Amino acid sequence: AYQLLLSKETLNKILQYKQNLEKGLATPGKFFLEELSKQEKSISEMDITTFTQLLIQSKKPQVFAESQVYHDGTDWTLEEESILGDVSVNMPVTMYNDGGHGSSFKNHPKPISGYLAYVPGALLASGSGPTSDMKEVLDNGKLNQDKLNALYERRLLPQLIHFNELARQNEKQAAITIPGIGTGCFSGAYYDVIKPYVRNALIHILEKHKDSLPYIDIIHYDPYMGDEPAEKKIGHMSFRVSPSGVVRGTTGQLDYPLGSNPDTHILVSIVAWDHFSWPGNDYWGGARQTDDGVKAASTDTMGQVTGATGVYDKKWGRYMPPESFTKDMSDWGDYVRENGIVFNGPVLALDKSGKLDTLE
Ligand SMILES: Nc1ncnc2c1ncn2[C@@H]1O[C@H](COP(=O)(O)OP(=O)(O)OC[C@H]2O[C@H](O)[C@H](O)[C@@H]2O)[C@@H](O)[C@H]1O
């Protein structure tokens, strides 16, 4: 029902980390250790896929990565955090509204079927000393455009390759909507300077891998505000920058961009996710707030992850937990605590040749 993806570089980091845990050169963080203790095998006796799944399973339904983490053995180590930020997840979804924040959403008369790809952006904020992503892309506290290009390339390429093959298997092209990933909460002190960097990072990936993405046609980038409305042609792809608060009538994220439709294109939206949380994040707590929480609440994301069938509330634009649970603490996070649900699924990685395959 959901699929975890990662780059070649991320699998090399899992491999190194697994080796170090076997050799005694590393010790696991508190939350990864808790998930290992719920299982019988040791680090040495486990395969790389089981190891990867248990590290991903340390994610909690709700965690604010920018403010609630210490980046040490008390929660998640800088090593685990390096791996976790690179993990993305995708799932097919029924989109019930266009994704408008607050009361602005428009309900789909007939729910649209598409896909969500949850990808964490550069974590450049912290309430406890520098993050793994701050160490990588910052040179003396200044944003490095080329290091940011490398980070987003590593995170977004496994999903871009995944949806390119899916659109070829469906005989359609791809229409992908992308928000201003890493430009809000995760930008920290760089809030006033980050928007051009994320837009240039997306241009860079699509310019680099255009030969590997033929069945990808529309890229609709909506950073809400702080970017000039523009149309750019990257090879065969059309990259559009249409900030909703700048360009009135902009197509919503969970809606078909202009020049795409259900018969010619498959609809994919990127979701600005968190290193340490389950896909919905804030919406596990009932709040339809961030890009992450608005997109999970506006789709059946919670139904995909928990396996339960919820009920869409047209007035609040939220996918609510089953009536049988609530009749009796009734948000989606309490549903998972009541039923013992864990975030654990299949995981694929890009190999040397640039294709997705098993981790063993
Ligand atoms: N009313 C609005 N309507 C539409 N878009 C908005 C609005 N306000 C801001 N945006 C834009 O929505 C875009 C994304 O901003 P963010 O949601 O913070 O994403 P991140 O990657 O920085 O932080 C990830 C964390 O936030 C989640 O909790 C996750 O689970 C993580 O914890 C920005 O371009 C905004 O300008």
Residue numbers in the entry: 42 to 369, 373 to 404
Q: How is this structure described in the published paper?
A:
In particular, effectors of the SidE family interfere with host protein ubiquitination in a process that involves production of phosphoribosyl ubiquitin (PR-Ub). The activity of LnaB requires a motif consisting of Ser, His and Glu (SHxxxE) present in a large family of toxins from diverse bacterial pathogens.
The negatively charged residues D315, D323, and D333 likely form a catalytic loop (β8-α8) that directly interacts with the hydroxyl groups of ribose by hydrogen bonding. Mutational analysis indicated that all three residues are critical for the ARH activity of MavL against ADPR-Ub. Indeed, recombinant MavL effectively hydrolyzed ADPR-Ub into ADPR and ubiquitin, which is in contrast to DupA and DupB. In addition, we observed four water molecules around the ADPR moiety, two of which (H2O-1 and H2O-2) are also found in other macro domain ARHs.
